[PDB]
Amino acid sequence: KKGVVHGVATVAEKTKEQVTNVGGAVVTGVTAVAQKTVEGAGSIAAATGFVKKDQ
Amino acid sequence: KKGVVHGVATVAEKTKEQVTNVGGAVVTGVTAVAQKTVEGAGSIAAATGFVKKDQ
Amino acid sequence: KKGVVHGVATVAEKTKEQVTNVGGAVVTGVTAVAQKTVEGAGSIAAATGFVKKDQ
Amino acid sequence: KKGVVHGVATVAEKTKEQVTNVGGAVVTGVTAVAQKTVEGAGSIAAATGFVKKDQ
Amino acid sequence: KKGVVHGVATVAEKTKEQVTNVGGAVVTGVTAVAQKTVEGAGSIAAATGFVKKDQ
Amino acid sequence: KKGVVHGVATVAEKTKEQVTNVGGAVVTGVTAVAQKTVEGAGSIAAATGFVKKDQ
Amino acid sequence: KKGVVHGVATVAEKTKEQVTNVGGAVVTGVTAVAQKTVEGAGSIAAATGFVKKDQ
Amino acid sequence: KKGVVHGVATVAEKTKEQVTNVGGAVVTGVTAVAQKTVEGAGSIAAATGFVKKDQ
Amino acid sequence: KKGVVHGVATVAEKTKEQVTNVGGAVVTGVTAVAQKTVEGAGSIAAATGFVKKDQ
Amino acid sequence: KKGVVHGVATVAEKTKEQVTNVGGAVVTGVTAVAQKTVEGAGSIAAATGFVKKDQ
Amino acid sequence: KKGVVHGVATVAEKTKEQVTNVGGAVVTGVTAVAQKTVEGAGSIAAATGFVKKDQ
Amino acid sequence: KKGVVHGVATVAEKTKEQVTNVGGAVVTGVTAVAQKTVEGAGSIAAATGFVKKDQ
């Protein structure tokens, strides 16, 4: 076989899960957050996949 | 087989789940948030997939 | 087989779920949010798939 | 087989769900929000798929 | 076989999970956060995959 | 076989899991955080994969 | 002060919430159930406060 | 002060929450259940407060 | 002070939370269940407070 | 002071939390369950407070 | 002071937490379970407080 | 002071935590279980407080 990509690719066979991202956010997984009190200014309480590039 | 992509591709066979994103947000997964009190200015309480690029 | 894409593609066979996004938001998954009080100015309380690019 | 796309495509066979988006928003999934009090100016209380690009 | 990529690629066969990211965040895994009180200004309480590049 | 990459690639066969990242965050693994009280200003309480490059 | 009860009482002052039950069911709290498929004969899918005394 | 009870009482002062139960079920707390597929005959999927006394 | 109870009592002062139960079930706490597939006959998947006295 | 109980009592002062139980189940605490697949016949997957007295 | 109990009592002053149980189950504490696959017939996967007296 | 009990009592002053149990299970402590695969028939995977008296 032959393949040429510029990116971003994701090429496969017999594949149970696939995610391609440029951005941006993708949530595909099981996630449970239980929480009782959030205070403070300002605290990232429960972050799973996170990116902060403030300018 | 032969394939040429510019991106972003996601090419496969026999594949249970697929997500392609440029952006942007995609939520495909099970997610449960239970929460009782959020305060503060300003706190990201429960973030799963998150991207903040303020300018 | 042969395939040429510019992107964004998502090409497959025998595939249970598919999402293609450029944008933008796509919500296809099970999601439960239970919440009792949100305060503060301004706090992202419960974000699952999120993108903030304010200019 | 042969396929050439400019994007955004989503090409498949035997496929239970499909979403193509450029925009914009698409909601196809089960979603339950129960909520008791929202205050503050201005707090994103419960966001599932979200994109904010204010200029 | 032959392959030439510019990156970022992810090329495979017989592959159970795949993630390609440029960004950005991708959450595909099981995650449980249980939490009782978050205070302080400002403390990253529970971060799983995290990136902070404030300027 | 032959392969030329610019990076970042991840090329394989018969491969159970794959992650490619430039960024950014990717969470694909099982993660359980149980927590009772977070205080202080500001303390990284429970960080699993973490990167802080404040300028 | 003086008090004599036979039960079931609930006596208080300055009290934000009160429930007295003999029975029976009382639901006063925030509750969110999101659900996609229930099968089987017969499975209690999502029970919060539950009592089964079949004879 | 003086108090004589037969039960079940709940006597207090300055008290934020109170529940008295004989039965029976009382749900006063925040609860989020997100769920995707329940099968089997018969499996208690997600039970929070539960009592089964079949005869 | 003086107190005589038969039970079940719960007597207090300056008390943030109170539960009295004979039964029966009481749910007053924050609870998040996220779940993707339940099978089998019959398996208690996620039980928090649970009592089974089948005869 | 003087007190005579038959049980079950719970007598106190200046007390943040109280639970009295005869039964039965009481859930007052923060609880997060995230789960991806439950199989088998029949396996107690995730039990927190549990009592099984089958006859 | 004077006290006579039959049991089960729990008598105190200045006391942050109290639990009295005859039964039965009481869950008052922070608990996080994250889980990916449960199989087998039948295996107690993750048990925190547990009692099995089958006859 | 004077005290006569039959048991089970728990009598105190200035006491941060108290548990009285006859049964039965009580969970009041912080607990985190993260788990990836459970198999076998039948293996107690992760047990914290456990009692098995099958007859």
Ligand SMILES: Cc1cc2nc(/C=C/c3ccc(O)c(Br)c3)sc2cc1N(C)CCOCCF
């Ligand atoms: C193997 C492969 C296969 C492949 N298949 C495609 C789509 C076909 C199609 C089939 C039917 C359609 O209708 C359409 Br539209 C499209 S792209 C693609 C790319 C590749 N590679 C780059 C792998 C080479 O490994 C080099 C590493 F050294």
Ligand SMILES: Cc1cc2nc(/C=C/c3ccc(O)c(Br)c3)sc2cc1N(C)CCOCCF
């Ligand atoms: C400067 C910049 C540079 C940049 N470079 C990229 C790589 C693309 C690529 C990806 C994979 C490839 O193979 C190739 Br070739 C190329 S995205 C990107 C975004 C930015 N920004 C400043 C947008 C942030 O918005 C401001 C916040 F408000």
Ligand SMILES: Cc1cc2nc(/C=C/c3ccc(O)c(Br)c3)sc2cc1N(C)CCOCCF
């Ligand atoms: C990482 C971080 C992230 C973070 N993110 C925010 C979002 C605000 C917002 C964003 C978007 C909105 O729409 C609104 Br309203 C509000 S505050 C904040 C604070 C922090 N930290 C300081 C902890 C770093 O610790 C360094 C060493 F200790």
Ligand SMILES: Cc1cc2nc(/C=C/c3ccc(O)c(Br)c3)sc2cc1N(C)CCOCCF
């Ligand atoms: C500067 C920039 C740069 C940029 N570059 C991209 C890469 C595309 C690509 C992706 C994959 C590829 O293979 C190739 Br080639 C190319 S998107 C993008 C967006 C931006 N912005 C500033 C928009 C933010 O809006 C302002 C917020 F209000």
Ligand SMILES: Cc1cc2nc(/C=C/c3ccc(O)c(Br)c3)sc2cc1N(C)CCOCCF
């Ligand atoms: C400066 C910069 C540089 C940059 N360089 C990249 C590499 C791409 C690549 C990746 C893989 C490759 O093989 C090749 Br070739 C190339 S992304 C990127 C983004 C930026 N920014 C300043 C955007 C941040 O936005 C400001 C926050 F508001």
Ligand SMILES: Cc1cc2nc(/C=C/c3ccc(O)c(Br)c3)sc2cc1N(C)CCOCCF
């Ligand atoms: C502890 C246990 C508990 C347990 N509980 C069930 C509930 C069924 C049900 C109960 C109520 C309902 O309404 C329905 Br429908 C269904 S199966 C089960 C199995 C077990 N074990 C096998 C572990 C014993 O260790 C063996 C060797 F060590």
Ligand SMILES: Cc1cc2nc(/C=C/c3ccc(O)c(Br)c3)sc2cc1N(C)CCOCCF
């Ligand atoms: C046999 C029995 C006995 C029993 N004993 C109790 C104690 C009360 C007490 C509690 C605290 C005290 O201080 C004193 Br004194 C007394 S409840 C109770 C319920 C039963 N049942 C068989 C009902 C189950 O229904 C059948 C299922 F379908």
Ligand SMILES: Cc1cc2nc(/C=C/c3ccc(O)c(Br)c3)sc2cc1N(C)CCOCCF
């Ligand atoms: C046999 C029995 C005995 C029993 N004894 C108790 C103690 C009360 C007490 C509690 C505290 C005290 O200080 C005093 Br005195 C007394 S409850 C209880 C329940 C039962 N059963 C068989 C009901 C189960 O139902 C069958 C399942 F379907």
Ligand SMILES: Cc1cc2nc(/C=C/c3ccc(O)c(Br)c3)sc2cc1N(C)CCOCCF
């Ligand atoms: C100290 C105490 C205090 C107490 N107070 C009650 C309710 C008053 C009330 C007050 C106002 C009302 O309106 C009502 Br109704 C009722 S029962 C009780 C029991 C006791 N003890 C047994 C402790 C003795 O320690 C012996 C150990 F050695």
Ligand SMILES: Cc1cc2nc(/C=C/c3ccc(O)c(Br)c3)sc2cc1N(C)CCOCCF
């Ligand atoms: C046999 C039995 C005996 C028994 N004894 C207790 C002690 C009370 C006590 C507790 C504290 C004290 O100070 C005093 Br005095 C007394 S409860 C209890 C329950 C039972 N059963 C068979 C019920 C199980 O139901 C069948 C399952 F389906």
